[PDB]
Design a protein around this ligand. Structure first.
Ligand SMILES: NC[C@H](Cc1ccc(Cl)cc1)C(=O)N1CCN(c2ncnc3[nH]ccc23)CC1
Lengths: 10, 316
């Protein structure tokens, strides 16, 4: 369904 | 304390910016493990050191049925290594893509297990995971949850202890993090809410392709549910997805205990969850130990300072 997500830090 | 040679390198499991994760065989023991291999330059230059070290400290100091155990951590001249429990069942994100929706029973199983893990990290350990999502939730060979990727954790959070860093995964960010507010350990419950929403409803509770639009939905739009959703589920997801953390299920002094008491989980003996007594409603059908079919196809087909006190070996 939804596309793959990416973790992040400011 | 051991080195690069003590392992065979069989299958690629995932590439990232910071390095790769390979399925390894331990020469000395024949036991299969997952090894994260971080290039030291990339870590130092992309400024990922703090996270790398947080994952080291978090793994070493945690022992739980539904958290990826760390066996060795060692470093070469140019690399950083994490030898960890192999989760051959792949990512929840894999399975849910295939199946669209899970049943409530099935979502309750994973839910309970996630609650067990998050409770342990909060009330023992004083940790906040912060990055709960389908991609970070894996299955072992039996079909039990294993949580990976502890780089975005925070240590020393004891109750109302609040944090400031803007981090996580945009689609899962809790309203109080999206406001630039101080936030407690209750963001993990928001995360639980979104994960469980996705399992039962077959979609993210808030989605726009555009991050600012997305953040706007998360801050302003009130949750809606599919009309086939049972009220016990509906209540749970409402509680977890409250925008004010002080109202969120799990937001008080009771933390996980509040979610454990919710009638969606009525039949669950929480000791049995922890003891893996519960029947996984899906067993991964891996034939061999090298069966990587629940892993992504693009990877599966094979396709500089010293760090003080980084090295580590699991005890007994
Ligand atoms: N999920 C998110 C994560 C993102 C990522 C990718 C590569 C690297 Cl360099 C670091 C993080 C990922 O895709 N990974 C690939 C799979 N991997 C695993 N697979 C199976 N058992 C495991 N035990 C520990 C990690 C692990 C965990 C890391």
């Amino acid at each position: 369904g939804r596309p793959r997500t990416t973790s992040f830090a400011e | 304390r051991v080195t690069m040679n003590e392992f065979e390198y069989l299958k690629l499991l995932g590439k990232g910016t910071f390095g790769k994760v390979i399925l390894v065989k331990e020469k000395a023991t024949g036991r299969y493990y997952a090894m994260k291999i971080l290039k030291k330059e990339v870590i130092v230059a992309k400024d990922e050191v703090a996270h790398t070290l947080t994952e080291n400290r978090v793994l070493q100091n945690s022992r739980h049925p539904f958290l990826t155990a760390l066996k060795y951590s060692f470093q070469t001249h140019d690399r950083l290594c994490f030898v960890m429990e192999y989760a051959n069942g792949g990512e929840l994100f894999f399975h849910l893509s295939r199946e669209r929706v899970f049943s409530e029973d099935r979502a309750r199983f994973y839910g309970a297990e996630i609650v067990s893990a998050l409770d342990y990290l909060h009330s023992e350990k004083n940790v906040v995971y912060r990055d709960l999502k389908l991609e970070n939730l894996m299955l072992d060979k039996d079909g039990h949850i294993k949580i990976t990727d502890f780089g975005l954790c925070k240590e020393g959070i004891k109750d109302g202890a609040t944090m400031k860093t803007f981090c996580g995964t945009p689609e899962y960010l809790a309203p109080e993090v999206l406001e630039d507010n101080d936030y407690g350990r209750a963001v993990d419950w928001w995360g639980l809410g979104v994960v469980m929403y996705e399992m039962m409803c077959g979609r993210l509770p808030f989605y726009n392709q555009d991050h600012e639009k997305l953040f706007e939905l998360i801050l302003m739009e009130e949750i809606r549910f599919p009309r086939t959703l049972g009220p016990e589920a509906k209540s749970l997801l409402s509680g977890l997805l409250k925008k004010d953390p002080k109202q969120r299920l799990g937001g008080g002094s009771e933390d996980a205990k509040e979610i454990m008491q919710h009638r969606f989980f009525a039949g669950i003996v929480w000791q049995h969850v922890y003891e893996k007594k519960l029947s996984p409603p899906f067993k991964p059908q891996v034939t061999s130990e090298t069966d990587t079919r629940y892993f992504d196809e693009e990877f599966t087909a094979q396709m500089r300072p010293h760090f003080p006190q980084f090295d580590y070996s699991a005890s007994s």
